[PDB]
Design an enzyme around this catalytic site. Structure first.
Site, PDB file in Angstrom:
ATOM      1  CG  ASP A   1       0.700   0.046   0.964  1.00 13.26           C
ATOM      2  OD1 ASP A   1       1.137  -0.304  -0.212  1.00 13.26           O
ATOM      3  OD2 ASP A   1      -0.653  -0.071   1.230  1.00 13.26           O
TER       4      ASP A   1
ATOM      5  CG  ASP B   1      -4.799   1.695   2.530  1.00 12.63           C
ATOM      6  OD1 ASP B   1      -4.245   1.027   1.530  1.00 12.63           O
ATOM      7  OD2 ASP B   1      -5.675   2.312   2.368  1.00 12.63           O
ATOM      8  CB  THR B   2       0.629   3.743   2.556  1.00 10.94           C
ATOM      9  OG1 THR B   2       0.772   2.822   1.568  1.00 10.94           O
ATOM     10  CG2 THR B   2       1.740   3.690   3.658  1.00 10.94           C
TER      11      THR B   2
ATOM     12  NE  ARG C   1      -1.520  -3.273   0.283  1.00  9.79           N
ATOM     13  CZ  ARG C   1      -1.857  -2.837   1.338  1.00  9.79           C
ATOM     14  NH1 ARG C   1      -0.866  -3.353   2.443  1.00  9.79           N
ATOM     15  NH2 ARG C   1      -2.868  -2.161   1.673  1.00  9.79           N
TER      16      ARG C   1
ATOM     17  CD  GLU D   1      -2.711   3.372  -3.946  1.00  9.08           C
ATOM     18  OE1 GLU D   1      -1.547   3.152  -4.838  1.00  9.08           O
ATOM     19  OE2 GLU D   1      -2.956   2.609  -3.088  1.00  9.08           O
TER      20      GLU D   1
ATOM     21  NE  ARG E   1      -0.740  -6.742  -3.608  1.00  9.55           N
ATOM     22  CZ  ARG E   1      -1.629  -5.668  -3.338  1.00  9.55           C
ATOM     23  NH1 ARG E   1      -1.202  -4.303  -3.423  1.00  9.55           N
ATOM     24  NH2 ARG E   1      -2.629  -5.798  -2.688  1.00  9.55           N
TER      25      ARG E   1
HETATM   26  C1  LIG Z   1      -3.407  -5.822   2.864  1.00  9.10           C
HETATM   27  C2  LIG Z   1      -4.211  -6.943   2.010  1.00  9.10           C
HETATM   28  C3  LIG Z   1      -4.870  -6.515   0.803  1.00  9.10           C
HETATM   29  N1  LIG Z   1      -5.454  -7.361   0.340  1.00  9.10           N
HETATM   30  C4  LIG Z   1      -6.251  -7.061  -1.128  1.00  9.10           C
HETATM   31  C5  LIG Z   1      -7.641  -6.434  -0.755  1.00  9.10           C
HETATM   32  C6  LIG Z   1      -7.941  -5.454  -1.924  1.00  9.10           C
HETATM   33  O1  LIG Z   1      -8.704  -5.930  -2.715  1.00  9.10           O
HETATM   34  P1  LIG Z   1      -9.237  -4.652  -3.784  1.00  9.10           P
HETATM   35  O2  LIG Z   1      -8.041  -4.391  -4.790  1.00  9.10           O
HETATM   36  O3  LIG Z   1     -10.296  -5.662  -4.407  1.00  9.10           O
HETATM   37  O4  LIG Z   1      -9.827  -3.704  -3.215  1.00  9.10           O
HETATM   38  C7  LIG Z   1      -6.350  -4.924  -2.243  1.00  9.10           C
HETATM   39  C8  LIG Z   1      -6.013  -3.586  -1.805  1.00  9.10           C
HETATM   40  O5  LIG Z   1      -4.573  -3.517  -1.977  1.00  9.10           O
HETATM   41  P2  LIG Z   1      -3.771  -1.743  -2.174  1.00  9.10           P
HETATM   42  O6  LIG Z   1      -4.269  -1.021  -0.860  1.00  9.10           O
HETATM   43  O7  LIG Z   1      -2.312  -2.347  -2.406  1.00  9.10           O
HETATM   44  O8  LIG Z   1      -4.314  -1.532  -3.326  1.00  9.10           O
HETATM   45  O9  LIG Z   1      -5.433  -5.829  -1.968  1.00  9.10           O
HETATM   46  C9  LIG Z   1      -5.450  -8.812   0.533  1.00  9.10           C
HETATM   47  O10 LIG Z   1      -6.040  -9.602   0.068  1.00  9.10           O
HETATM   48  N2  LIG Z   1      -5.007  -8.894   1.645  1.00  9.10           N
HETATM   49  C10 LIG Z   1      -4.342  -8.338   2.565  1.00  9.10           C
HETATM   50  O11 LIG Z   1      -3.798  -8.577   3.780  1.00  9.10           O
HETATM   51 CA   LIG Z   2      -2.506   1.551  -0.385  1.00  9.12          CA
END
Ligand SMILES: Cc1cn([C@H]2C[C@H](OP(=O)(O)O)[C@@H](COP(=O)(O)O)O2)c(=O)[nH]c1=O
Ligand SMILES: [Ca+2]
Length: 129
Positions: A15, A34-35, A29, A37, A75
Site C-alpha cells: 500500500d 491496509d495491506t 500511501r 506488512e 506521505r
Molecule cells: C491510510 C492512512 C494512514 N494514516 C496514518 C494512520 C496510521 O498512524 P499510526 O502509525 O499512528 O498508527 C498510519 C498507518 O499507516 P501504515 O498502515 O502504512 O503503517 O498512517 C493517515 O494519517 N491517513 C491515512 O489516510
Molecule cells: Ca500496511
C-alpha cells in the site's frame, strides 16, 4: 475528483509506492486500505500485486480526495490508478487489503471499496480464506 499525472520511481510494499509527482519524489500511501506488512501473512503477495500493477502501467495517475493530501509521516495520500484501474480497489477485490483508515475528509471511494471487500470475502480470497 480529478486524476493527475505521475511516474513510477519505485514499488515499496502492498500500500506504499514511490512516485514522481509535480517533478518531486514522494512516497504515497493508498487511501482507504491496509495491506499486511511484508513480514506478515499475504504481505509478500500484496507487495507483489501492487508492484506488477504499477510497474506494468504505461500511465500512472494520482487522485487526491477532498481532505488531507499528506499524512503525519509526510506521505502523499491518494487513490493511485494504473492505466485507468484503481490499485486501492484492486487490492481489496483480491483480498490482499482490507478497507481501513476511513477518515471523514477522505472517503469518496469508500462504498466502492467496501463493495469489493464484500465480494472478496464472499469468495474467501487470500486474507479471507
Ligand atoms: C491510510 C492512512 C494512514 N494514516 C496514518 C494512520 C496510521 O498512524 P499510526 O502509525 O499512528 O498508527 C498510519 C498507518 O499507516 P501504515 O498502515 O502504512 O503503517 O498512517 C493517515 O494519517 N491517513 C491515512 O489516510
Ligand atoms: Ca500496511
Amino acid at each position: 475528483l480529478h486524476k493527475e499525472p505521475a511516474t513510477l520511481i519505485k514499488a515499496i510494499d502492498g500500500d506504499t509506492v514511490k512516485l514522481m509527482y509535480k517533478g518531486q519524489p514522494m512516497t504515497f500511501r493508498l487511501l482507504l486500505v491496509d495491506t499486511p506488512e511484508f513480514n506478515e501473512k499475504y504481505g509478500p503477495e500484496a507487495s507483489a500485486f501492487t508492484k506488477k500493477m504499477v510497474e506494468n502501467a504505461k500511465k500512472i495517475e494520482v487522485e487526491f480526495d477532498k481532505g488531507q493530501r499528506t499524512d503525519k509521516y509526510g506521505r502523499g495520500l491518494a487513490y493511485i490508478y494504473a492505466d485507468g484501474k484503481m490499485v486501492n480497489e484492486a487490492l481489496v477485490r483480491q483480498g490482499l487489503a482490507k478497507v481501513a483508515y476511513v477518515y471523514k475528509g477522505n472517503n469518496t471511494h469508500e462504498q466502492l471499496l467496501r463493495k469489493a471487500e464484500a465480494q472478496a470475502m464472499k469468495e474467501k480470497l487470500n486474507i479471507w480464506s
